[PDB]
Amino acid sequence: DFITKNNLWTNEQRDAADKVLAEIDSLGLEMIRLSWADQYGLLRGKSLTVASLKSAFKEGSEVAIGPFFFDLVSSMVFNLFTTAGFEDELSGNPTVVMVPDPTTFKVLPWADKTGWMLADLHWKSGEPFPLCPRGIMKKAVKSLSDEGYLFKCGIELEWYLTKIVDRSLSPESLGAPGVQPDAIQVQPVAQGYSVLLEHHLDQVDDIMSKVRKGLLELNLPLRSIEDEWAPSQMETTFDVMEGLEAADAALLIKSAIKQICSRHGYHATFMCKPAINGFFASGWHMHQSLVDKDTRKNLFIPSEGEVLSPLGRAYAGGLLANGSAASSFTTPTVNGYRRRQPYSLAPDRRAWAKDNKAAMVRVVSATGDPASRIENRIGEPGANPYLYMASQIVSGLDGIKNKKDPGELQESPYDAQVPMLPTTLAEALDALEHDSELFRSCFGDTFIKYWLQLRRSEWARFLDAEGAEAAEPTGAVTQWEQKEYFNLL
Amino acid sequence: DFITKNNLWTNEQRDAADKVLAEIDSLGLEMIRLSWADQYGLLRGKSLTVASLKSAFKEGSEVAIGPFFFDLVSSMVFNLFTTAGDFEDELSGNPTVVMVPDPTTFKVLPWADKTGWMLADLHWKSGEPFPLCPRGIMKKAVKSLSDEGYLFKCGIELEWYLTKIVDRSLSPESLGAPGVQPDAIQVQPVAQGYSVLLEHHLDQVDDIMSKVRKGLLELNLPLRSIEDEWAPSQMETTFDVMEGLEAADAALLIKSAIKQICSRHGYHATFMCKPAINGFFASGWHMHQSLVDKDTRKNLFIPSEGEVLSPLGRAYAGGLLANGSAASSFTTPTVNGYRRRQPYSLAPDRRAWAKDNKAAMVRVVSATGDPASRIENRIGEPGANPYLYMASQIVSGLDGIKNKKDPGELQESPYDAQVPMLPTTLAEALDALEHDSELFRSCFGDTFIKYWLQLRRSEWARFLDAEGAEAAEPTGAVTQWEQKEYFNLL
Ligand SMILES: Nc1ncnc2c1ncn2[C@@H]1O[C@H](COP(=O)(O)OP(=O)(O)O)[C@@H](O)[C@H]1O
Ligand SMILES: Nc1ncnc2c1ncn2[C@@H]1O[C@H](COP(=O)(O)OP(=O)(O)O)[C@@H](O)[C@H]1O
Ligand SMILES: C[S@](=O)(CC[C@H](N)C(=O)O)=NP(=O)(O)O
Ligand SMILES: C[S@](=O)(CC[C@H](N)C(=O)O)=NP(=O)(O)O
Ligand SMILES: [Mg+2]
Ligand SMILES: [Mg+2]
Numbered sequence: 001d002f003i004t005k006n007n008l009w010t011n012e013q014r015d016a017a018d019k020v021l022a023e024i025d026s027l028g029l030e031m032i033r034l035s036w037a038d039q040y041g042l043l044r045g046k047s048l049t050v051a052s053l054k055s056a057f058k059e060g061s062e063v064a065i066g067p068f069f070f071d072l073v074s075s076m077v078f079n080l081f082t083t084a085g086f087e088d089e090l091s092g093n094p095t096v097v098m099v100p101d102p103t104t105f106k107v108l109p110w111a112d113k114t115g116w117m118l119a120d121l122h123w124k125s126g127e128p129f130p131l132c133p134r135g136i137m138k139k140a141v142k143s144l145s146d147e148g149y150l151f152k153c154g155i156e157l158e159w160y161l162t163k164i165v166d167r168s169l170s171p172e173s174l175g176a177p178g179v180q181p182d183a184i185q186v187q188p189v190a191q192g193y194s195v196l197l198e199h200h201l202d203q204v205d206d207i208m209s210k211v212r213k214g215l216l217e218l219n220l221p222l223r224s225i226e227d228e229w230a231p232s233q234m235e236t237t238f239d240v241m242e243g244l245e246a247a248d249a250a251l252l253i254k255s256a257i258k259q260i261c262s263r264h265g266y267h268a269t270f271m272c273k274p275a276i277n278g279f280f281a282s283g284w285h286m287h288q289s290l291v292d293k294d295t296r297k298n299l300f301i302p303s304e305g306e307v308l309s310p311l312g313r314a315y316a317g318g319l320l321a322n323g324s325a326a327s328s329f330t331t332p333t334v335n336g337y338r339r340r341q342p343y344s345l346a347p348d349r350r351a352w353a354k355d356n357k358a359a360m361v362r363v364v365s366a367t368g369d370p371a372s373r374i375e376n377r378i379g380e381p382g383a384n385p386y387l388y389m390a391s392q393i394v395s396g397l398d399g400i401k402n403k404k405d406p407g408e409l410q411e412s413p414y415d416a417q418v419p420m421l422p423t424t425l426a427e428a429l430d431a432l433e434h435d436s437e438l439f440r441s442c443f444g445d446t447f448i449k450y451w452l453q454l455r456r457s458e459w460a461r462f463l464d465a466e467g468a469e470a471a472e473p474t475g476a477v478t479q480w481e482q483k484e485y486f487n488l489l
Numbered sequence: 490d491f492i493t494k495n496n497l498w499t500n501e502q503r504d505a506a507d508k509v510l511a512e513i514d515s516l517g518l519e520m521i522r523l524s525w526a527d528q529y530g531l532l533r534g535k536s537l538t539v540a541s542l543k544s545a546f547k548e549g550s551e552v553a554i555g556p557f558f559f560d561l562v563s564s565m566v567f568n569l570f571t572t573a574g575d576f577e578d579e580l581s582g583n584p585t586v587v588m589v590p591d592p593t594t595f596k597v598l599p600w601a602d603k604t605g606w607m608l609a610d611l612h613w614k615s616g617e618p619f620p621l622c623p624r625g626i627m628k629k630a631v632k633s634l635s636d637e638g639y640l641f642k643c644g645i646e647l648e649w650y651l652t653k654i655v656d657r658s659l660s661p662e663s664l665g666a667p668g669v670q671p672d673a674i675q676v677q678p679v680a681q682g683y684s685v686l687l688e689h690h691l692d693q694v695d696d697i698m699s700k701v702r703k704g705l706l707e708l709n710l711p712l713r714s715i716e717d718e719w720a721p722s723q724m725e726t727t728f729d730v731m732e733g734l735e736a737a738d739a740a741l742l743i744k745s746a747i748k749q750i751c752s753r754h755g756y757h758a759t760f761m762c763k764p765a766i767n768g769f770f771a772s773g774w775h776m777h778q779s780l781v782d783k784d785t786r787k788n789l790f791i792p793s794e795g796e797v798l799s800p801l802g803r804a805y806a807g808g809l810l811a812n813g814s815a816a817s818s819f820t821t822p823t824v825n826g827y828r829r830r831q832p833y834s835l836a837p838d839r840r841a842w843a844k845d846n847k848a849a850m851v852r853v854v855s856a857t858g859d860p861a862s863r864i865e866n867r868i869g870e871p872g873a874n875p876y877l878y879m880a881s882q883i884v885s886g887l888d889g890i891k892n893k894k895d896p897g898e899l900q901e902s903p904y905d906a907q908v909p910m911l912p913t914t915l916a917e918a919l920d921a922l923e924h925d926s927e928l929f930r931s932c933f934g935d936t937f938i939k940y941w942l943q944l945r946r947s948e949w950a951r952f953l954d955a956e957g958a959e960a961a962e963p964t965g966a967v968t969q970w971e972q973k974e975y976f977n978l979l
């Protein structure tokens with residue numbers, strides 16, 4: 001019993017495991033997917049039979065770390081054939097153990113008799129695997145809990161709904177290791193640039209009603225479905241969730257949207273800005289408040305003369321001060337930097353403002369209002385949820401602990417004289433490299449080295465394919481971006 | 490609790506909220522839409538889950554005012570990125586407002602999956618009403634009329650086009666851009682025409698029209714008649730008398746339901762006045778209106794033996810006529826609607842009233858002692874914003890009542906009357922409003938009028954740059970700009 005021997009499950013987790021096995025027998029489920037987010041936030045793993053899952057509830061399930069050493073097209077960035085003497089060399093294909101987390105169990109409503117659960121990656125020694133994004137989120141959550149606070153997050157996701165025309169499965173379109181396969185061919189499902197039009201919601205509801213039902217059956221706190229600005233651009237928002245549960249929920253939300261749509265011949269994409277005429281950039285704005293661990297009261301609520309409590313003001317200051325170093329985490333994709341431009345309802349600057357969607361940090365609050373909170377509009381829909389939320393926790397807590405000041409609330413953020421944000425992924429990586437202390441301390445030195453190496457390899461690929469001129473945010477979306485992100489994100 | 494704090498719900502509304510939640514639970518609904526009319530009369534908003542709606546019955550639901558600062562194709566007319574120090578003076582920024590649900594408007598949408606529907610009033614986070622909300626302008630008109638002791642009674646008679654969709658124009662090359670018109674939906678007529686009121690036409694189109702009929706009846710809208718209008722595929726739907734804000738709400742829902750049901754079955758219903766399709770003649774929205782007593786609920790327009798209307802109704806008509814040019818942009822808000830401002834079209838080109846003559850702006854339908862006695866204002870277009878159209882009527886008529894204005898002589902031949910001509914272009918309607926702005930600045934609000942003038946002139950400049958002055962003349966052919974501006978959404 002690997003799990004008990006290394007005391008990897010709390011009592012809550014073990015009892016949850018008992019009730020999960022009961023639900024599996026009662027429903028007659030036949031498969032249970034055991035998955036974990038990779039560096040890109042994509043779910044990787046295996047589907048197990050009932051017997052194999054009950055065995056994994058004791059021994060775990062051995063898996064290889066290959067995904068971490070691959071980019072999205074399986075370029076070998078770190079050599080996988082040499083057993084290392086690991087955290088210093090980042091080489092080899094060592095085996096890790098998927099340790100199931102029973103509290104995350106779900107029945108997938110769109111699949112045949114299939115359940116679903118996340119796993120934490122552990123060395124066979126029993127120590128956590130240092131590249132696991134979920135582990136990084138757990139570390140951030142624990143540091144926040146050590147400071148006496150809980151992270152409350154409202155998930156607000158923009159994405160694109162399209163109808164599949166060709167799945168690009170012909171042999172000649174499959175690429176190779178390090179060679180992008182062809183993008184799926186699609187057709188928009190509705191005109192746009194008539195924001196929040198009810199008729200648009202009705203027009204697409206033959207499929208969106210299935211997405212809605214799937215989310216509701218997964219017991220996710222769906223809050224709203226909305227027609228976004230662009231043609232076929234949708235928005236789904238969720239009620240407030242807390243910490244690790246919130247990150248897991250975002251992961252499942254994106255997975256479920258994509259799988260339901262594909263099951264009915266649609267392609268949902270969280271690629272920031274697809275290379276399709278008429279498609280405007282999508283954003284992932286992170287609504288966030290801190291509550292007291294004990295009182296469970298929103299500690300961002302302002303007084304009469306304030307936009308935020310002094311605690312929320314310092315949290316905003318930390319968000320702004322670290323927004324450049326954290327850019328590669330909030331906006332991991334090269335195509336996410338298409339949003340780094342003015343007059344776009346997306347931030348190009350490290351500025352905060354009250355109820356102004358031109359700013360990076362938008363304060364939504366009223367005196368005494370427990371909904372008072374920060375909206376960070378820097379994120380992209382394809383961000384790894386664990387890294388996005390952990391970067392937010394780390395930045396805000398750095399602001400609180402070092403009592404950093406956000407400065408003046410900016411009326412007219414796009415004319416503000418504040419430090420500019422990175423305009424390319426390379427700039428974001430540069431910003432992290434030269435200001436790495438906070439994230440090396442909180443995310444881990446080994447992880448930051450691995451991250452820098454991998455993301456720079458991807459940037460070199462993009463630059464080799466398209467050239468430097470293309471990186472310009474206002475430029476047209478390149479085919480490299482489409483063939484890197486459209487299918488999988 | 491935003492709603493209770495600012496005393497935004499009456500007791501009737503709170504009771505309705507309780508029953509709305511009970512019906513939602515009993516029917517097992519999963520989504521409830523919260524919608525509101527924008528400046529154009531188009532429903533904007535969100536679809537909420539049950540839990541989120543239950544929260545919105547206490548705190549409301551935040552939204553941005555973006556729609557008000559966009560035109561139909563999302564040209565940014567007002568800077569949305571500089572927050573204003575004084576919003577009503579600068580009209581800039583993207584401030585947040587609160588959708589406050591109105592539980593008395595709740596409906597189950599019969600054509601959708603487990604979906605309810607409700608209107609919301611936009612309120613500042615301070616708790617004050619949002620000054621550009623069309624429903625608020627109507628609420629203000631209903632209040633001013635009630636203060637004088639009268640109730641607005643309106644019979645909705647909308648004309649519209651029913652076509653079958655051939656191509657939804659969803660190819661990426663057809664989607665447009667911010668401020669750039671997308672391609673019009675391609676359609677096909679459903680029946681020949683120029684055989685007015687033919688029963689066989691009604692039967693021919695009834696495979697879908699029966700669905701529209703059932704949808705309207707299940708929404709408890711007081712449908713009165715379905716009729717074959719003159720042109721090929723031109724329909725008419727009329728409704729029994731409704732009152733004030735409820736009448737405006739009903740018109741809005743009526744148009745929304747017609748369009749959604751038709752689209753659900755592969756048809757396109759359009760309230761664009763005159764589509765750029767060969768053979769399609771202009772559609773009209775004639776507003777039938779009477780005033781009743783707030784207490785006796787008896788028609789105060791009913792004439793005596795030697796009169797076509799009571800003195801109140803004759804003074805109400807005078808107010809309509811005197812202010813008909815200033816109100817033109819409200820009754821006839823689209824460029825395309827001014828294709829009706831021509832002299833032998835059963836549509837008005839002049840500020841004249843007449844008894845039972847459909848050539849005049851104001852047609853009096855009455856008989857001595859007949860509670861059906863009323864005024865028909867034939868100036869409106871089907872694509873009008875119901876709130877602004879009905880409110881313009883209330884405002885003009887009450888102005889006529891208070892100034893005891895004389896409608897003048899009933900015109901036997903309204904198209905030969907030597908009376909002021911009505912504006913022939915949207916630009917002219919805006920000029921007329923600007924030069925005669927007192928009444929509508931006072932009753933609709935000064936900020937709303939400044940905003941309206943700026944927005945509509947920006948749209949007119951777009952049309953003029955795209956088609957030229959030669960095109961504006963009413964009898965000219967309908968331009969591609971008009972089709973691509975109005976066909977899909979109106
Ligand atoms: N105290 C809070 N802390 C964090 N998020 C919150 C809080 N209260 C509400 N939210 C969240 O804020 C989000 C609002 O989404 P949305 O209505 O799209 O905002 P906007 O469109 O103005 O950015 C929801 O995800 C909701 O869960
Ligand atoms: N007292 C009244 N006040 C306002 N409208 C009325 C009154 N009595 C009847 N109506 C309305 O008059 C309209 C008649 O429509 P219709 O017969 O199509 O008009 P038309 O005579 O122009 O063809 C209906 O909408 C009906 O509700
Ligand atoms: C209306 S928008 O500002 C659109 C944002 C844009 N798609 C972007 O962030 O790139 N999102 P929201 O109003 O929900 O906060
Ligand atoms: C037969 S008609 O006179 C023609 C109306 C025309 N479509 C118009 O443009 O106003 N309308 P209605 O019967 O409702 O009075
Ligand atoms: Mg939003
Ligand atoms: Mg009629």
Ligand SMILES: [Mn+2]
Binds near residue numbers: 158228235
């Ligand atoms: Mn949005």
Ligand SMILES: [Mn+2]
Binds near residue numbers: 156375
């Ligand atoms: Mn947002």
Ligand SMILES: [Mn+2]
Binds near residue numbers: 648718725
């Ligand atoms: Mn007619």
Ligand SMILES: [Mn+2]
Binds near residue numbers: 646775865
């Ligand atoms: Mn009529």
